[PDB]
Amino acid sequence: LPLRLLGRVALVTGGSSGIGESIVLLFRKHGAKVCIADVQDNQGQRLCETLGGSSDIAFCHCDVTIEDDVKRAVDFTVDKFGTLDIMVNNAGVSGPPCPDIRDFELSAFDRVFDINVRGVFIGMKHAARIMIPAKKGSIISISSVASTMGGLGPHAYTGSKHAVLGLTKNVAAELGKHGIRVNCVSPYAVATTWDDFRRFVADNANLQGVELTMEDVANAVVFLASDEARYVSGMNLMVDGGFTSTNHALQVFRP
Amino acid sequence: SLPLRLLGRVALVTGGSSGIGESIVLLFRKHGAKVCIADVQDNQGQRLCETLGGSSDIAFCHCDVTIEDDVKRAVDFTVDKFGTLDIMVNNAGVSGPPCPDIRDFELSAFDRVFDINVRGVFIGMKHAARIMIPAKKGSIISISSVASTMGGLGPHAYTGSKHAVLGLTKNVAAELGKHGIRVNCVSPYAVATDTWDDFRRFVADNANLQGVELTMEDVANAVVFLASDEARYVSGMNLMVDGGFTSTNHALQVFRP
Amino acid sequence: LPLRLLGRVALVTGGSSGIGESIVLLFRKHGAKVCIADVQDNQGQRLCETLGGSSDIAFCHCDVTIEDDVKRAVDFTVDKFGTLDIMVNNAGVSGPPCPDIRDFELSAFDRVFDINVRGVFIGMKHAARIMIPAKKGSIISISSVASTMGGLGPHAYTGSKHAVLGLTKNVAAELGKHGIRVNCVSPYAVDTWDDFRRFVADNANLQGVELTMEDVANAVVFLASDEARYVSGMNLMVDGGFTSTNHALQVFRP
Amino acid sequence: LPLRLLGRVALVTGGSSGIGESIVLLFRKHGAKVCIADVQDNQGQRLCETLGGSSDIAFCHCDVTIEDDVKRAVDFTVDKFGTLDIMVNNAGVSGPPCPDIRDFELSAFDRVFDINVRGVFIGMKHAARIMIPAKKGSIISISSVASTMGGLGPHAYTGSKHAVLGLTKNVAAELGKHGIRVNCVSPYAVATDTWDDFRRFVADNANLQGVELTMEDVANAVVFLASDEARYVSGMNLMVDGGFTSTNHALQVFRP
């Protein structure tokens, strides 16, 4: 059986660390060619040194809040590997916790929407510039459980994660007529006072007995990137173990 | 007979000079409320100001909802006129030009829509909260649209912002529930605010509910409901006024020819 | 200002007690003529004696699990008051708590779907028989928060409440072409009396107010009136934000 | 790289034909052992002769509307292959089209809920009897787009598909504490005079153009939720509708 992504070209924004690093590593294992677009042009190569000088991985410096940067990333990728088949919008931030809305600064608010929403739309816009004439492609954005439910995070974070789902569904509507799939992946809180946050998210988890790892989220992306999701679009794939579809506040099934 | 449904309540309406906001203001006033309009362009702001008359239970404050200090002055003005703030209506909203190809969507156009639709709504929540939290009572209502739940019903920036408003509504409802404050949003179907007849026929043909046309007063009635004590335990709700448009899909012609 | 439901005829299934009793009382305050369809004539009229022997309220005995019973209710209401404008499907049960699915009896399962789903569909079907030629009407079903989220109740209950939402949306699709509105109302939970009262309030999103039966009734009155003349396919939550939020991570609640 | 389901035991209700046949064939390609539970034991083995002879596939006659039948299916599978790791509830019917609710017979209504809802719950109940002491497993039900949107099918069908989603979420809540994943897969209409014309019709109203929804596409979704790549996926309605339910092209914003 061939590798699930053999020959496909992928661009991953924020791939230098965190979930993006997992996605990049998993994509390579399944035969993909991957370009990382991330800030701090030193660190993206610094990660690239760790994984080696493979001729199927490349780094482009890109601030996803600048349209011309993301443009240069896509133009760079198609010049290395000849096309662009997968676009992963992983750049995302949360903002500081704010327990009282009366202390929520609009500057903090503005920054989160600039990165979480504007950055994702720019990625869709320039991936579309390649994928539409090819009549094929797969666009994947990393949302979180805050895309479907309130109270799971700060206001600007929750609003932006909802906005990403709305963009996903609307752009899925426009790009469906060209064969382009748009989807988003919404994870539960992932660890990495360490075992204290690790215990907390596990105690409030619906699914007990396994910990949500970064590789779990990556596996969801790999699915939506491959031809096994060939007819999947406009979908918010939850990797929350059932956290959002349930509520154990009345203690019907949990003590 | 029975008392008026909003008697003695103070309301602030952003964008009340025209359109749906004008209906909300007029309906609120019919049910006994005191209303302050916050709207831009004092030329249009005075335009309605004279239009309604000179009553001592209506007032106008000039406010660009994209400026936090403007909305701050609106709230501070209202509580100085009528003594408190019980209802906050975020009706300022824009759609943007139609754009059929994402490859031609300008980020400046994108930025403007989110500034007004999302940032303006959050600022309204933030400063209404500054009054309503110490009173331990209030009702915040935002005017979304059917684009808050379904894709393809409008441009990208519009659909994203309407989704963002629903997300803010639910999240702020989570924070303000502790204090007895209700946060909800109202999502209308397209309203026809010779080409008028042509758009009017188009939205009616694609409507789920036939034999009636969505008027501005219909949307206002939904707000009046969520503003009153008949919605005393309603919060976090996206009250659709779409006649079933979003909950159904007649593309397979099971029930429509 | 006139009463919000003046001259309107309403049928309420399960209106002898609980939420249905409040819906009936509220409907009458707003000028409606109301027919109650409920079991146990010995009690169905006995409560109808406490309200009084008015000429704008009537009782018909009806097992909502029997199609011919619901049929006679609608035929009775129309013969009393001349038409049928509002149909309220309030008959609903939950079943015993079952903490382990391996002990869930299928007979218990069958009974809940018979009353909660089959009873609601029969109500829609025979209300439709009147409302379609009139080209007007409003059908309202009483769901609960279990219509949108799992874990808030037993399996058969949660499944049936989801089924009611699905029927509501699908029948809204068919009856929209005739001007008929279909909606559903999903309430939050309303010495064990007092200790249940504190428990639902502690886990409530909206604090400082308790969900009363009159609150749910007000939602129905809204969807029954012309103030909702363009509302259809809607699941109106009266849960104070309970289903749209989750305080398990203690972001906003301690 | 090993096969994605190597050593896992799966029970598939309705596996003789349609989507279930593809799920069985795909599961087998990825190393799984499969038991088919389907009515009409005549045809039920006829497929088991169609696919071929194998010591990793088996057939049990089972009416999913009878609890004791499904019970015997699970007890049969565990005795053949030693455990039960995957349970697929594919048995499902739709009922005749009914354009006017005033002509909808309650007998027709009763039959659809008996098979679509009661059959699915029985499958969950008896899969749970095995999977809870093992502290592992994956339960997958085949819903359709009618689980999320009205108007896409008859009333009894749409109600039952909604009920299945509700059961999925609620049972996911109870079985999460044991490590058991419950999910459902909701496909768009699959084609396989009125063949090429129903096929041309669902494609015109599809959001995603240039690709036809095949049965193998739906099977791939199940394989995903059956494997350890969905190890933390539960309570999920995985749409395979190409974006059909998340969009609405009635206003012709993006489609002419």
Residue numbers in the entry:
A (entry chain B): 13 to 204, 220 to 282
B (entry chain D): 12 to 204, 219 to 282
C (entry chain C): 13 to 202, 219 to 282
D (entry chain A): 13 to 204, 219 to 282
Show sentences the authors wrote.
BDHs belong to the family of short-chain dehydrogenase–reductases. Some BDHs have a high twofold stereoselectivity in the conversion of chiral monoterpenoids by preferring one of the two substrate enantiomers and forming a stereocenter by asymmetric reduction of the diastereotopic keto group. Here, we report the determination of the structures of two stereoselective dehydrogenases, SrBDH1 and SoBDH2, by single-particle cryoEM.
We produced SoBDH2 with an N-terminal His6 tag (theoretical molecular mass 32.2 kDa) in E. coli and prepared the protein at high purity. From the 1 551 724 particle images that were initially picked, 173 781 particle images were selected by iterative 2D and 3D classification cycles for homogeneous 3D refinement. The protomers adopt a Rossmann-like fold as required for binding of the NAD+ cofactor. The quality of the density allowed the modeling of 50 double conformations of amino-acid side chains and the localization of 268 water molecules.
